[model samples]
Target: ADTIVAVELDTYPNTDIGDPSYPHIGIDIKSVRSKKTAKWNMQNGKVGTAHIIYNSVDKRLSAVVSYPNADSATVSYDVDLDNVLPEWVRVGLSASTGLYKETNTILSWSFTSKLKSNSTHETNALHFMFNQFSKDQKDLILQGDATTGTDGNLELTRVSSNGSPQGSSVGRALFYAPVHIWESSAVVASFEATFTFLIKSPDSHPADGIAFFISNIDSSIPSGSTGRLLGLFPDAN
Candidate 1:
């Protein structure tokens, strides 16, 4: 992901980097702090196999190594590609033998990936304009002190009266429907949210603006979501 999302066949341990005392199979997210490791019994002069598997939907990377003469070893760790790596990436394989000089060979190797988990194939879109406030409000619930202006924009509170100061009005405007987000394997969906509004202060005072939020279905509006918390941090935090 961010660094190198790599699997390692560490035949030797180096205290300088704090590696495990014995030979092992490892899943390396970073170079030195390589904590996710498993026992690897590497025998001399024997043919062996190494398998690297990435189950992307669950965000897990796994490695398996085995020889006919010894039991298999495996190591795995969870990593979400979207949050860690750049849009495009290259894969590679490499091996090394330090100053002592031992044989580390790659007889043959192959790689395959389920690209769906990293790219989008389907899209869902919802667009709303305050001009359709009355009609669209059926699909976008407006709760608490929220109101839609006449031929105007949505407001989280009553507009400041000509002279009276505006009081904090806690409220919410949310989507009416729900859909399956994620589970099982890679269906690979993308999501986006956008809105535009201006905060016009009646005088020289700071104001808490609106917030755009998404949550699971069957969820209730949090109580006491008011003041500087802005309906996000819940009651009295």
Candidate 2:
């Protein structure tokens, strides 16, 4: 089901789907057609902040876009979300530059919801959004070849040919945070996590992908995790 709701800061012009213009703020629900739009040109090579807020009382979804030392703009539409969305929704951002070579990234994010959640183990658990993994963040486990890189990112697999080619290895990072998936059955925590990542590959030949999963609190690597296993489902021998 393509039931994604989006607040798009559209720049590319796709005449096929009838884009509003080159730089307009469009509110999309499900399909790509924008229900409403506002005239706002985007700046290149600059950073700005956008807050998309939904007011349950008025049933209005508003977008407030602001920049440093500049005036902000607000656009909203009156639409009831209860009829369009489920009781629980997953939220995330998406960036796509179809025919251009531009890098889009999020520096930080914050979310707040008044939904009731069970925080039975959050008092002593750990979480992370690593930028070089500070002293406090090093408590998370890293096995196989996962290490903090000097370029301010987690280098999952080291690419130095130290007797064995790096392509023949697997790197795994484990977080000890408690995600209570079962104690309440259907009543799980309403939490949102956002992390920006990139998969670097040479333009010559791109291979397979990595596995980002959750498992029991163990720091051991599986036997076949490397060499085509992507560091998961190890032999218990």
Candidate 3:
């Protein structure tokens, strides 16, 4: 669904030509982004121009609006196959200038639709393959008891607490970010991430080993978890 209209108007002051409320007019517009069910506004005295673009093949809708001072705002959203498109569209205006006359006009207006194609895989890769965790590592998100040092190394350790200073414990650290998926095409939600971590000890002995996992739920460590469970499964007790 789409609509585009440009308007220009002229109004007269109430018996005072040089008054602050003297002859002035502008346009106010509201429309929807194609494919995605989102609304955008080009209100009078707010935005001076705007545009909407839809990529049906990729199932994405984007909108942009510009102010008179050259400032602009843009937003994009994805459209799913199960999303129901809008069925009706309505436009109107209302104004009251008691005893004053006003003139409104549309400079130019147009609405259009077109057919458009795409090949090649467009994938975005986010990697936390850092040798050391530092302040500049803004992309990698940390959760739970995850900690880092000046060397840029991430530590996911179950530090000893006040009550039980030397007991088996449960702890976890999750890291992830949002990824874009193409719903209109046959693109699979697939990507590659390489991670390298080492577990060291004072002697050549180890307790519970950490597991590398990929899941939609990032932070899902179980309570009272330890040993072979690796904080993933629920504790029996």
Q: Highest TM-score: give the candidate number.
A: 2
Better-scoring candidate (lDDT), 2 or 3:
2
lDDT of 3 by residue, 1-237 (tens): 122211112222222312123222222122111112222222322213334444435554444544456645454556431242321211111111112211111111122332211345444333333444654446444433444552344444433333111225434434434333223543332222223333333222233333232223333544443443334434221
Sort the predicted structures by TM-score, highest score first. Answer: 2, 1, 3
| Model 1 lDDT tens row, 141-207 | 5666555543344554444445222554555555554433343443653332223333333333223
Global CA lDDT of candidate 1, please?
A: 0.46
> Deviation in angstroms for 146 in model 3?
2.2
- What's the TM-score of each model vs. the native? 0.48, 0.51, 0.38
Off by over 4 Å in 2: 115-237
Q: Mind sharing the TM-score for model 1?
A: 0.48
Clashing pairs in 3: 11-23, 132-152, 132-153, 133-152, 133-153
lDDT by residue for model 2 (178-234), tens: 333222233322332333334333322222223233333333555454432234433
TM-score (C-alpha, index-matched) for candidate 3: 0.38
Candidate 2, after superposition: displacement of residue 195 in Å? 12
Q: lDDT: which candidate is best?
A: 1
Tell me the lDDT of candidate 3: 0.31
